[PDB]
Every structure is written in C-alpha cells, then in structure tokens.
mmCIF file of C-alpha atoms in Angstrom:
data_model
loop_
_atom_site.group_PDB
_atom_site.id
_atom_site.type_symbol
_atom_site.label_atom_id
_atom_site.label_comp_id
_atom_site.label_asym_id
_atom_site.label_seq_id
_atom_site.Cartn_x
_atom_site.Cartn_y
_atom_site.Cartn_z
ATOM 1 C CA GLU A 49 0.000 0.000 0.000
ATOM 2 C CA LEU A 50 3.107 2.245 0.688
ATOM 3 C CA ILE A 51 1.221 4.936 2.629
ATOM 4 C CA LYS A 52 -0.617 3.140 5.486
ATOM 5 C CA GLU A 53 -3.975 4.210 7.121
ATOM 6 C CA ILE A 54 -1.909 5.586 10.097
ATOM 7 C CA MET A 55 1.676 6.835 9.452
ATOM 8 C CA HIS A 56 4.551 7.986 11.667
ATOM 9 C CA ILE A 57 6.476 11.255 10.989
ATOM 10 C CA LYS A 58 9.883 12.652 11.968
ATOM 11 C CA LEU A 59 10.963 16.219 11.124
ATOM 12 C CA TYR A 60 14.164 18.273 11.053
ATOM 13 C CA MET A 61 14.047 22.049 10.573
ATOM 14 C CA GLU A 62 16.640 24.797 10.736
ATOM 15 C CA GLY A 63 16.762 28.421 9.674
ATOM 16 C CA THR A 64 17.284 32.140 10.384
ATOM 17 C CA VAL A 65 14.378 34.552 10.839
ATOM 18 C CA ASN A 66 15.759 38.101 10.925
ATOM 19 C CA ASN A 67 19.259 36.536 11.192
ATOM 20 C CA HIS A 68 18.264 34.615 14.365
ATOM 21 C CA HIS A 69 19.517 31.074 13.671
ATOM 22 C CA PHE A 70 17.465 28.243 15.216
ATOM 23 C CA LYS A 71 16.929 24.461 14.807
ATOM 24 C CA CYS A 72 13.645 22.485 15.393
ATOM 25 C CA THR A 73 12.822 18.781 15.536
ATOM 26 C CA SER A 74 9.554 16.865 15.458
ATOM 27 C CA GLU A 75 7.788 13.533 15.800
ATOM 28 C CA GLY A 76 4.178 13.152 14.692
ATOM 29 C CA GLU A 77 1.488 10.871 13.203
ATOM 30 C CA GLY A 78 -1.742 11.094 11.220
ATOM 31 C CA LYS A 79 -4.384 9.419 9.033
ATOM 32 C CA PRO A 80 -3.182 10.125 5.462
ATOM 33 C CA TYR A 81 -6.483 9.129 3.850
ATOM 34 C CA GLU A 82 -8.605 11.070 6.370
ATOM 35 C CA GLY A 83 -6.497 14.251 6.059
ATOM 36 C CA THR A 84 -5.687 14.539 9.782
ATOM 37 C CA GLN A 85 -2.310 14.586 11.581
ATOM 38 C CA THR A 86 -0.629 15.654 14.857
ATOM 39 C CA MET A 87 2.906 17.069 15.324
ATOM 40 C CA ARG A 88 4.918 17.595 18.517
ATOM 41 C CA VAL A 89 7.627 20.210 17.887
ATOM 42 C CA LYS A 90 10.751 20.902 19.966
ATOM 43 C CA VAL A 91 13.045 23.918 19.375
ATOM 44 C CA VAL A 92 16.468 22.334 19.932
ATOM 45 C CA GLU A 93 18.554 25.480 19.167
ATOM 46 C CA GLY A 94 18.193 29.260 19.216
ATOM 47 C CA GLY A 95 16.819 29.332 22.815
ATOM 48 C CA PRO A 96 13.320 30.788 23.214
ATOM 49 C CA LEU A 97 12.507 32.013 19.679
ATOM 50 C CA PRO A 98 12.377 35.830 19.385
ATOM 51 C CA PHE A 99 9.720 35.546 16.619
ATOM 52 C CA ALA A 100 6.227 34.047 16.755
ATOM 53 C CA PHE A 101 6.283 30.251 16.148
ATOM 54 C CA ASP A 102 3.156 30.666 13.926
ATOM 55 C CA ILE A 103 5.369 31.739 10.995
ATOM 56 C CA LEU A 104 7.004 28.197 11.087
ATOM 57 C CA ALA A 105 3.778 26.233 11.666
ATOM 58 C CA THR A 106 2.615 25.750 8.012
ATOM 59 C CA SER A 107 6.066 24.243 7.076
ATOM 60 C CA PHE A 108 5.595 21.309 9.645
ATOM 61 C CA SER A 110 2.254 17.435 5.303
ATOM 62 C CA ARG A 111 0.710 17.178 1.861
ATOM 63 C CA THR A 112 0.769 13.327 2.089
ATOM 64 C CA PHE A 113 -1.943 13.589 4.893
ATOM 65 C CA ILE A 114 -4.679 15.072 2.668
ATOM 66 C CA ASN A 115 -8.134 13.465 2.340
ATOM 67 C CA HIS A 116 -8.549 13.245 -1.398
ATOM 68 C CA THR A 117 -12.432 13.117 -1.636
ATOM 69 C CA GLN A 118 -14.516 13.016 -4.982
ATOM 70 C CA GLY A 119 -11.789 11.033 -6.862
ATOM 71 C CA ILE A 120 -8.912 13.480 -7.217
ATOM 72 C CA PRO A 121 -5.495 12.054 -8.116
ATOM 73 C CA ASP A 122 -3.194 12.437 -5.123
ATOM 74 C CA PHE A 123 0.042 13.868 -6.558
ATOM 75 C CA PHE A 124 1.655 13.604 -3.065
ATOM 76 C CA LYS A 125 0.787 9.984 -2.226
ATOM 77 C CA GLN A 126 1.443 8.904 -5.854
ATOM 78 C CA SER A 127 5.046 10.208 -5.448
ATOM 79 C CA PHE A 128 6.159 7.417 -3.042
ATOM 80 C CA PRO A 129 8.460 5.645 -2.097
ATOM 81 C CA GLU A 130 10.781 8.407 -3.392
ATOM 82 C CA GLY A 131 8.569 11.245 -2.118
ATOM 83 C CA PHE A 132 8.322 14.906 -3.101
ATOM 84 C CA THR A 133 9.829 18.378 -2.583
ATOM 85 C CA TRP A 134 8.252 21.819 -2.059
ATOM 86 C CA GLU A 135 9.388 25.463 -2.141
ATOM 87 C CA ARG A 136 7.036 28.031 -0.534
ATOM 88 C CA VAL A 137 7.285 31.859 -0.280
ATOM 89 C CA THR A 138 4.979 33.552 2.242
ATOM 90 C CA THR A 139 4.619 37.317 1.947
ATOM 91 C CA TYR A 140 3.168 39.196 4.977
ATOM 92 C CA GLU A 141 1.161 42.457 4.771
ATOM 93 C CA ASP A 142 3.844 44.212 6.860
ATOM 94 C CA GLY A 143 6.779 43.288 4.611
ATOM 95 C CA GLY A 144 7.846 40.073 6.320
ATOM 96 C CA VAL A 145 8.868 37.350 3.833
ATOM 97 C CA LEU A 146 9.379 33.734 4.890
ATOM 98 C CA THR A 147 10.818 31.332 2.337
ATOM 99 C CA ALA A 148 10.796 27.596 3.119
ATOM 100 C CA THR A 149 12.390 24.638 1.318
ATOM 101 C CA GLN A 150 11.113 21.123 2.172
ATOM 102 C CA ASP A 151 12.039 17.507 1.436
ATOM 103 C CA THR A 152 9.667 14.580 2.047
ATOM 104 C CA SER A 153 11.040 11.040 1.967
ATOM 105 C CA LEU A 154 9.977 7.573 3.222
ATOM 106 C CA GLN A 155 12.727 5.773 5.218
ATOM 107 C CA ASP A 156 12.003 2.498 7.046
ATOM 108 C CA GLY A 157 8.256 3.161 7.495
ATOM 109 C CA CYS A 158 8.578 6.401 9.525
ATOM 110 C CA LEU A 159 7.893 9.507 7.082
ATOM 111 C CA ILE A 160 10.803 11.994 6.953
ATOM 112 C CA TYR A 161 10.525 15.781 6.552
ATOM 113 C CA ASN A 162 13.543 18.096 6.194
ATOM 114 C CA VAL A 163 12.850 21.859 6.192
ATOM 115 C CA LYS A 164 15.065 24.989 5.558
ATOM 116 C CA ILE A 165 13.692 28.392 6.778
ATOM 117 C CA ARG A 166 14.641 31.955 5.731
ATOM 118 C CA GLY A 167 12.626 34.778 7.225
ATOM 119 C CA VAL A 168 13.555 38.390 6.399
ATOM 120 C CA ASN A 169 12.150 41.955 6.864
ATOM 121 C CA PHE A 170 9.795 41.061 9.732
ATOM 122 C CA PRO A 171 9.160 44.505 11.291
ATOM 123 C CA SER A 172 10.784 45.031 14.721
ATOM 124 C CA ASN A 173 7.604 46.164 16.562
ATOM 125 C CA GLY A 174 5.273 43.990 14.482
ATOM 126 C CA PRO A 175 3.033 41.131 15.640
ATOM 127 C CA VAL A 176 5.559 38.423 14.683
ATOM 128 C CA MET A 177 8.673 39.935 16.346
ATOM 129 C CA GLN A 178 6.797 41.172 19.435
ATOM 130 C CA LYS A 179 5.263 37.587 19.675
ATOM 131 C CA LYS A 180 1.701 38.914 19.877
ATOM 132 C CA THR A 181 0.106 36.358 17.512
ATOM 133 C CA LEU A 182 -2.500 33.683 18.198
ATOM 134 C CA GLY A 183 -3.596 30.882 15.789
ATOM 135 C CA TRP A 184 -4.049 30.594 12.058
ATOM 136 C CA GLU A 185 -7.637 30.854 10.848
ATOM 137 C CA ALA A 186 -8.864 28.052 8.500
ATOM 138 C CA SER A 187 -7.525 28.622 4.940
ATOM 139 C CA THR A 188 -8.093 27.265 1.389
ATOM 140 C CA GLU A 189 -5.349 26.454 -1.120
ATOM 141 C CA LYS A 190 -6.030 26.435 -4.866
ATOM 142 C CA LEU A 191 -3.853 23.880 -6.602
ATOM 143 C CA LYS A 192 -3.378 23.838 -10.377
ATOM 144 C CA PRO A 193 -1.097 21.469 -12.368
ATOM 145 C CA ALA A 194 1.934 23.591 -13.377
ATOM 146 C CA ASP A 195 4.227 21.840 -15.891
ATOM 147 C CA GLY A 196 4.923 18.443 -14.292
ATOM 148 C CA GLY A 197 4.245 19.568 -10.733
ATOM 149 C CA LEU A 198 1.556 21.354 -8.749
ATOM 150 C CA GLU A 199 1.379 25.047 -8.015
ATOM 151 C CA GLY A 200 -0.485 26.018 -4.883
ATOM 152 C CA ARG A 201 -1.581 29.525 -4.019
ATOM 153 C CA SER A 202 -3.396 30.456 -0.761
ATOM 154 C CA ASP A 203 -4.376 33.514 1.303
ATOM 155 C CA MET A 204 -4.071 33.186 5.116
ATOM 156 C CA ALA A 205 -5.010 35.251 8.202
ATOM 157 C CA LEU A 206 -2.962 35.081 11.387
ATOM 158 C CA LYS A 207 -4.998 35.799 14.553
ATOM 159 C CA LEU A 208 -3.615 38.610 16.724
ATOM 160 C CA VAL A 209 -3.400 39.001 20.498
ATOM 161 C CA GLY A 210 -6.548 40.918 21.473
ATOM 162 C CA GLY A 211 -7.173 42.151 17.952
ATOM 163 C CA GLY A 212 -7.865 41.308 14.345
ATOM 164 C CA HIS A 213 -5.451 39.650 11.945
ATOM 165 C CA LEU A 214 -2.146 40.162 10.181
ATOM 166 C CA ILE A 215 -2.891 38.739 6.722
ATOM 167 C CA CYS A 216 -0.477 37.075 4.256
ATOM 168 C CA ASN A 217 -0.347 34.911 1.100
ATOM 169 C CA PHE A 218 1.921 32.214 -0.266
ATOM 170 C CA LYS A 219 2.971 30.653 -3.556
ATOM 171 C CA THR A 220 4.177 27.017 -3.446
ATOM 172 C CA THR A 221 5.641 24.660 -6.060
ATOM 173 C CA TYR A 222 5.450 20.884 -5.459
ATOM 174 C CA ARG A 223 7.925 18.715 -7.301
ATOM 175 C CA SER A 224 7.547 14.927 -7.354
ATOM 176 C CA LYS A 225 10.648 12.732 -7.075
ATOM 177 C CA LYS A 226 8.912 10.144 -9.364
ATOM 178 C CA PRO A 227 8.989 11.168 -13.057
ATOM 179 C CA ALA A 228 5.820 12.923 -14.328
ATOM 180 C CA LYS A 229 5.396 9.987 -16.784
ATOM 181 C CA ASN A 230 4.668 7.736 -13.764
ATOM 182 C CA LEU A 231 1.986 10.054 -12.318
ATOM 183 C CA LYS A 232 -1.761 10.561 -13.028
ATOM 184 C CA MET A 233 -2.048 14.373 -12.560
ATOM 185 C CA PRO A 234 -5.083 15.997 -10.890
ATOM 186 C CA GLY A 235 -7.231 18.810 -12.283
ATOM 187 C CA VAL A 236 -7.489 22.275 -10.726
ATOM 188 C CA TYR A 237 -8.663 21.513 -7.178
ATOM 189 C CA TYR A 238 -8.930 23.032 -3.677
ATOM 190 C CA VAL A 239 -7.681 21.958 -0.242
ATOM 191 C CA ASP A 240 -9.381 23.401 2.875
ATOM 192 C CA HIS A 241 -7.003 23.515 5.905
ATOM 193 C CA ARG A 242 -7.568 23.845 9.677
ATOM 194 C CA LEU A 243 -4.369 24.361 11.672
ATOM 195 C CA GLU A 244 -4.829 24.349 15.437
ATOM 196 C CA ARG A 245 -2.246 24.622 18.245
ATOM 197 C CA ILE A 246 -3.097 21.963 20.860
ATOM 198 C CA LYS A 247 -0.427 22.529 23.601
ATOM 199 C CA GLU A 248 2.475 24.894 24.415
ATOM 200 C CA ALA A 249 5.282 24.614 27.009
ATOM 201 C CA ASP A 250 8.208 26.712 28.418
ATOM 202 C CA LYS A 251 8.089 29.830 26.142
ATOM 203 C CA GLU A 252 6.987 28.313 22.750
ATOM 204 C CA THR A 253 9.899 25.740 22.980
ATOM 205 C CA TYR A 254 7.482 22.744 22.894
ATOM 206 C CA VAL A 255 4.385 23.177 20.664
ATOM 207 C CA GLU A 256 1.773 20.556 19.710
ATOM 208 C CA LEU A 257 -0.074 21.166 16.399
ATOM 209 C CA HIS A 258 -2.983 19.434 14.731
ATOM 210 C CA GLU A 259 -3.972 19.842 11.046
ATOM 211 C CA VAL A 260 -7.000 18.801 9.011
ATOM 212 C CA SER A 261 -6.871 18.913 5.153
ATOM 213 C CA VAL A 262 -9.688 17.875 2.804
ATOM 214 C CA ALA A 263 -9.306 18.132 -0.973
ATOM 215 C CA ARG A 264 -12.224 18.806 -3.323
ATOM 216 C CA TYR A 265 -13.099 19.624 -6.920
ATOM 217 C CA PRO A 266 -14.623 23.143 -7.287
ATOM 218 C CA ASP A 267 -18.447 23.787 -7.311
ATOM 219 C CA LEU A 268 -20.647 24.217 -10.493
#
C-alpha cells in the first residue's frame, strides 16, 4: 500500500528569521487518507525564539490530505521516493518567509527536512513582538503547473486581542517520481484547519494538529 492508514512522521528544521539562527525537531502521526495529523515540535537550538512560532507552523504534510470526490493524489502517488516543495509567504507588513522542504519515506517512519529563511519582519510587528494567536482556516487552490503542482493560498494570522495580520503564499510541489509515472489531478482546492493543541516553556514545545480535505470546485 506504501502509505498506510496511520503513518509515523519525523521532522528536522533549521533556519534564520531576521538573522536569528534556530533548529527544530519533530515527531508526529496522522491518518493520510482522512487528512488529519498531529505534530509535537521541539526547538532544539536558538533558545526561546524571538519571533512568533506561527510563521514556522505551516512548514511542519501534503501526504496527509483526504482526497475526496476522486482526485489524483500527486503527493501519495510520489512514493516511495517522495516529493519536494518550495514556498514563499509574503506578509502584509513586509515580512517574507521562504521555506524549502524535502519529504522522503525511510524504514516506514515519514521523513521531513525543512530549511527556513525569514527576512524583513518589522521590529515592533506582531511576529517579532510575539503577539500572535492561531491561524484561521484557509483554502489552497492547486493547479497542475508543468509536471508539478502550483499552490496559491491567502491566510489570516490571529492577533493578540485584535484582528489579523494577513499574508499569502505561492508554493511549487515537485515529485521525485517522473511525471510519466503520475496521473495528474485537475485544478482543485484543499481546505485547511491548523490548530495549536499545547504549548510549554516559552513556545519551545508546541503541539499542532492539522486537518486537510481536498475537493473539486463547485458548479
């Protein structure tokens, strides 16, 4: 089957956000066919992060997406090799977070390897002052873009005692399997819900849950 009904995950992440180098590590598990998953994150380097963790949570699983209707799963079809993704998130206040990700399948446990580069996050802004809450539920429009998938989405980051700091991202998904060995999907949508379950000792340990359900557009 390759991708089982319940799958284990292990993650490695490192980066610099406003030149503040850090390193993160994770262990998680989800139901790939149901679109749910859970991730327990631990910041191993760069002490208590000077920026809001929320900018990183969104880089911590395309393989855990409930493909309803009968949409070809580009992500699951890409195994055992896996797939890569490059995302660029642009914030309304000038902050830009670029992330590079590698997904592989080694000895049953699913492996994620992320690279993070955050720049121009304003000093007294919600991210740097750590005055952000969760991410509101978002929707990503995916369209087949020459061999891979291109995903665009507009997100809203909840703010401490306020409204939101909005942003948008452009992502490119590249399969490790050749495009010849893949049945590509049409233009489809993925609705996401990203909730933070737990938090410990100054955003050093964070538990996150995600729910993703794919669907063909309405008529």
